[PDB]
Write a protein that binds this DNA or RNA. Sequence first.
RNA 1: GGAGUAUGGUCGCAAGGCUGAAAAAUUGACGGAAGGGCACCACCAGGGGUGGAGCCUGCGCGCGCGCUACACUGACAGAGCCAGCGAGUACUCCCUUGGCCGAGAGGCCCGGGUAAACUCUGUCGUGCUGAGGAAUCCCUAGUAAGCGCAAGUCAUCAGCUUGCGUUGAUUACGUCCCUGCCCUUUGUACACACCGCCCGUCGCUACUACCGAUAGAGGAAGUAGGUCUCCGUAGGUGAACCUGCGGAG
RNA 2: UUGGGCUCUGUGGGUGCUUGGCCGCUGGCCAGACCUACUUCAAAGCCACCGGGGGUACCUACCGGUUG
Lengths: 113, 297, 98, 119
Amino acid sequence: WSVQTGQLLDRLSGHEGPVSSLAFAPDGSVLVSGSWDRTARIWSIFSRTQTSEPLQLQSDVLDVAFRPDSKQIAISTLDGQLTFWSVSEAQQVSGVDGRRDVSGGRRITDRRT
Amino acid sequence: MLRKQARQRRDYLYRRALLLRDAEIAEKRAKLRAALASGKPLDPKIANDKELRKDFDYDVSRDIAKEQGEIDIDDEYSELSGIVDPRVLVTTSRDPSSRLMAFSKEIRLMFPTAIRLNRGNLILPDLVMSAQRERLSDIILLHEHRGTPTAITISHFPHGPTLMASLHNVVLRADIPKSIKGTVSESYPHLIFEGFRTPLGQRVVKILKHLFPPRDPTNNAKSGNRVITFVNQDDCIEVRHHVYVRTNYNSVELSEVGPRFTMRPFSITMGTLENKDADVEWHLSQYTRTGRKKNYF
Amino acid sequence: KPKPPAPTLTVVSDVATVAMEDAQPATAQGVAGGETSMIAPQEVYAPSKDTAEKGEVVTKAGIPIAKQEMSREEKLRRRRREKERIRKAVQSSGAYKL
Amino acid sequence: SLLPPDNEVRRKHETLLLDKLYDMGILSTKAKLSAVEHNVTVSAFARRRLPVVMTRLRMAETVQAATKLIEQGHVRVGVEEVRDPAFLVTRNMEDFVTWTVGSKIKQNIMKYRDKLDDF
RNA sequence: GGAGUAUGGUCGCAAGGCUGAAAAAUUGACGGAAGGGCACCACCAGGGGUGGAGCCUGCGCGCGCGCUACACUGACAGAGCCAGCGAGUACUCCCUUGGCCGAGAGGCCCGGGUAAACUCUGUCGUGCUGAGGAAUCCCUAGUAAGCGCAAGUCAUCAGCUUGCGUUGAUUACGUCCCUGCCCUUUGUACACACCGCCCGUCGCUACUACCGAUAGAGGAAGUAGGUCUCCGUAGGUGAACCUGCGGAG
RNA sequence: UUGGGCUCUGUGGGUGCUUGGCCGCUGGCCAGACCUACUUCAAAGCCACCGGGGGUACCUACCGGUUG
């Protein structure tokens, strides 16, 4: 939606599942979506084509982030790993599998170890 | 997504069979309600089915509101009828030919919110997938024979009904040199329909006229430059595309600008393009005794 | 699905942002914080036809002009502008022969 | 129903109750108040709990054994795991409630259907 | 008998021609200037058809649309190595010389008319053994194009339609300059922020007056602030007590 | 490395920051002891969750009366 007038602008679409977490690149060039359709999705909106580039992942997305230097995205998916991409050359450049690096558990009525 | 569309579409089918039972009921319920206002006596079974009377006392308001036209019926169109703009893509057959591709360009132009698409090397199941991942109103095919289009195939997506029709008597846009023809206006055309008098006629008009954008309702009868017509006789619906200027409150001039079709619809399925295992709704019955005598539409 | 939006009205006052906040021994806000009125100059006043003077009319700019001090040319053009917006919305043979 | 049939607020809340319960799945139609009356039932609630609806989607053979699974915790909803075996699966979530990440169950399925990705 | 429902037949009306084919408007009719948004029917980079010759469905001798041919991206011999869709007790291109066994109708037998591609190895070398003008029309990602394989679905379609797979590029991916098309100049939400009365020719309306025929329709124009306590009083229903007045704290 | 191994089954500390056991507790007791006395004056009120529509003769709650 447009802030300055309020009436709806554009239903972006393309997503094989609900869209899970969203953010703008801090310059404002890029909208980034992550959805549970295993996929993260570069929406360039304010260009004259309102284009889309896919990014296939391994599983569902959970959270997105940008770098203040607006070249890099960090998406945190469901296996638990982080995957770090550079936006322009849409290539993955880094990854961290942090499952044991975060597991702390054993709740009440949590009958797994 | 995919489990979701399977979920909803089957729920539509099952709710139809539900509507069958309950409308068989409401037939009886109708006669009760009329009698109360009328005081005319009634059928004694209706007078003495007890669950029916109590259920009347609950379910009055649906009947009277439907009499009012207060609601539109449950429908694969009624969910989003005049709310949001239907975007529509037109695709050719697998390996298109050039004159066909030009004619498809013509009917893309006639619609106002369309895209064409080069079909190329694309499995038609995955073209349905592209649909249900871009939330289209409508897919549309074209099949030529030899430079001349023969059949179109409207589907309503996400899961709706499909028309499939032959074409005949076609003229292109591209038999006329551009010195006489020209770029045609992408204004939201009006629609008119003549002679659809079956409930099946209203089915086919429903699947047609939910293609086009919603008109704005304030001055629509006054404004507007462009009018699309569907008229039908001998179950061969003929459709033209005209543009007009109003020279008087008593006089007007028309110009004919689209392609001229006659199509005769030969398959209407509550069921999309891939699903050949779906429930057809009316097919064109030659080969029978009086498939030539009777008409639908 | 939540509900259709039912239109709801809610009134605000003339008193300040500090009156909007909750209760605590200090205002956090600065010193220029506090003299702002929670509403806008538009809210307290805008010139309009509905508050116009008698012989005079307001402009779309919101400027006061008298119809008497008005010129005829501007009169014609403002009539045109208003209309533009509007459109956007048996006898004697003696008498007979003679 | 006691409200006279011709009223606006009656019409609005007929539609509201019906479509809301329908999106809670406990019904089967959305046009019949008599169906709300002598149809809406705690049994239908229970058949929209979680283990019953995972038998209906065919996660597991019998709803007992389904309870055993989701108590061990292989059964995810959305993106969370679920322990509470009364997590009432509304109709928008029946399409989503699926298997969890590191599950011996999911790997068993992939074993039988022969794609067993070790990655 | 009653209540419905149909169905047909009867009856009455509708069913008497100053007549002889080819408006509404306080809201309307039509522009114009500026500003935005868009589009392989716009610009720009390229690509690719058709249009040259032969074949023919189609459409109206003309016309394209598909198929074929046309040489360096060659020809011959090997070697190797890859698809996807298809299962109705169902499937055949002939039609013919002879002969067999067939009193006759036939059946025989012999004659005549799970892929291309791609890679590698080696042999020879432009040799009627010539890739299509002006025009026009189409195309921006598994797309142009190439390559085969299958099916043959109640409309169309074997002079072909439609599928599935295979290999897979260049080139813009921006800009409203040309062409256009649409939309602003009204509304439909308020904070900061900004903008600041678009323009033309007529219509319709109210009024004003003018002109000229017979009070009268016409013609032609403009305008739109003394409380509390106490006391002395007069009255009340009297001890008290209340009211009102007048004085002190 | 002059027996090895699986599996089962007990006990003991741990798996949360270390102040003793008990009782009629300002003391005593862990062998326990004394065992029943003493008294001026009943009370303040409220609330206090059973699934829905439905009937209500009898029981009950309430509310209004009636004789004694």
